[PDB]
């Protein structure tokens, strides 16, 4: 036993390792494996084809818009004026209080990121026979606001970058949207529950109107797919602006305070009955101050009789809820019974003059 007498280190405990850091960082863990060097392994038949990658997700088309293009449109008619962002809107005709929206995969994978930049590629799959002939400008205006979103026609469009398509025999093209902004990246459109518009707007006008033969249809539908381009890239990870539809229940927010439900009728040493959220002493459920008595709308606690009326009053310490003029009107403790708790945080503001 040599005595190690050099003065040792001098540092700082902390409670928890880093959460945001996830790349170049060996992270210590209390494993629940049996082997210490054990790593999950993939057999030869379990080969992961999809390296999960924003250039792999964003490189997939999603149908996001569909134009009913009829014959009787003039040479100035607007078919779509959708924004030149990944956040392209397509509403579902639902009756829910929150209407769900489809998104392009580039829109979903950019909805987890704060800033995006790069070209977008929109594939227009016009569904036409070889005998239908049409011709349509897919244009692009850099820098349009809300007021300048209108005033538009094809003639003001042909100033900016525009692409005329000759629908004669082939019926599919891919306008690669330029990223023309003053800012190198570009902030997300929607954000959290808190709304920047697009850097630029696409337009699609009918330059030469549809001329079908007499043996074919009058109307032609155009599919509009959206894909992140060959140069699409996003950077800062933030709160998503999009939520899943796995639980579409959304609860708009008198009751008990936060952290006192469930409760049940009981006793209190400074107090007959009063509601308690715990079996240890001085654990009365606290109540908010009404700016009256109470009657519930449903979930009551089960004593000997169920309890649907309560009188809120300060305790001389918060507001207790009580299920010589006051002491004569109290309820005796023999009605306590089993002490079965109330279902959640259910009250009624019965007012009388």
């Amino acid at each position: 036993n040599p005595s190690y007498q050099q003065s040792p280190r001098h540092f700082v405990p902390t409670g928890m390792h880093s959460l945001a850091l996830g790349t170049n960082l060996v992270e210590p863990l209390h494993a629940l494996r049996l082997d210490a060097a054990g790593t999950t392994q993939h057999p030869v038949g379990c080969a992961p084809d999809e390296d999960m990658t924003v250039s792999s997700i964003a490189s997939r088309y999603g149908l996001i818009r569909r134009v009913q293009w009829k014959k009787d449109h003039a040479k100035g008619s607007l078919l779509l004026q959708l924004d030149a962002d990944p956040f392209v809107e397509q509403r579902i005709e639902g009756t829910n209080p929150i209407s769900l929206y489809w998104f392009a995969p580039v829109g979903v994978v950019s909805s987890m990121f704060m800033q995006w930049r790069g070209s977008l590629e929109y594939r227009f799959d016009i569904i036409a026979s070889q005998f239908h002939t049409g011709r349509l400008i897919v244009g692009y205006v850099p820098g349009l606001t809300a007021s300048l979103q209108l005033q538009m026609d094809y003639m003001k469009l042909k100033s900016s970058s525009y692409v005329v398509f000759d629908l004669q025999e082939s019926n599919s093209f891919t306008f690669e949207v330029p990223y023309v902004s003053y800012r190198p990246w570009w902030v997300r459109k929607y954000g959290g529950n808190y709304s920047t518009d697009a850097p630029s707007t696409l337009f699609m006008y009918v330059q030469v109107p549809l001329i079908p033969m007499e043996a074919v249809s009058d109307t032609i539908d155009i599919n509009v797919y959206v894909r992140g381009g060959s140069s699409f890239e996003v950077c800062v990870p933030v709160q998503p602006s999009l939520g899943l539809n796995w639980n579409t229940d959304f609860i708009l927010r008198y009751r008990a305070k936060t952290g006192y439900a469930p409760y049940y009728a009981g006793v209190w040493h400074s107090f007959s009955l009063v509601f308690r959220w715990g079996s240890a002493s001085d654990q009365i459920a606290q109540w908010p101050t009404i700016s009256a008595f109470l009657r519930i709308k449903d979930q009551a606690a089960v004593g000997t009789q169920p309890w649907r009326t309560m009188v809120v009053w300060p305790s001389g310490h918060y507001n207790i809820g009580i299920p010589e003029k006051a002491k004569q009107l109290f309820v005796p403790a023999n009605q306590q019974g089993p002490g079965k708790v109330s279902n959640g945080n259910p009250w009624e503001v019965m007012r009388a003059p």
């Binding site: 057999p43 030869v44 038949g45 080969a47 084809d49 997939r60 088309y61 999603g62 149908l63 996001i64 569909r66 397509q90 769900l100 489809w102 392009a104 995969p105 799959d125 569904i127 036409a128 026979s129 070889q130 005998f131 239908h132 019926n171 007499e214 043996a215 074919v216 249809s217 009058d218 109307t219 032609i220 539908d221 599919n223 797919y225 539809n245 796995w246």
Partner: protein, 248 residues
Amino acid sequence: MDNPNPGPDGEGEVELEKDSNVVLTTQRDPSTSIPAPVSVKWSRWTSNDVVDDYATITSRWYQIAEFVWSKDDPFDKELARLILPRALLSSIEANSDAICDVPNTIPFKVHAYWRGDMEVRVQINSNKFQVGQLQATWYYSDHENLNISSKRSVYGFSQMDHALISASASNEAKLVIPFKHVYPFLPTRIVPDWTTGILDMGALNIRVIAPLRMSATGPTTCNVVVFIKLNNSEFTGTSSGKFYASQI
């Protein structure tokens, strides 16, 4: 360059797909879409009984669904939610006879556990003046999802890869569907650890992207045919055919 000379033979060149003894022809080129790479055979890890594919009978094609497709079907209309290792058998039962009567599916009657890849060719026979476009999309394990009813639309299946059947050019849709599932073998009958949802790889479903549009004298209907090959299959668990229950 674009030098037409039609004749008694016609102009175009016929391509084929010859199999064991079923040869089906297409004038048009397929729009192939392959959702996943070709799988490793997996017979080493979980089978001691004699595994023998039957390429002389199982790799034949078999028509499992034809259907009329009218113009009065709406925009996002289901046409066939075919569950491919189930609809192969349940179409045979739709012909109101047993599974033993068909040469393509007799190993499903004898053997117990199927694995393998499935080809799908959805031919269409639209007129050249008809305008409409379908999509054939494969989705792995449809019945294991519950929100799939909210996903089952063209806006959702156009994000995964898929084939497109344009009624304009009478396009044909090859669809190479390899076996990917949770467990590396699909069971073909009542089975000790699951009975409900048997032999269910997923769902070939063919929604409509844009319906048939035509003039007032136009040909309204449009017949659609679906074929299935079972090419790199294998079977294990030789068992009695009296345990094979009828499919749902």
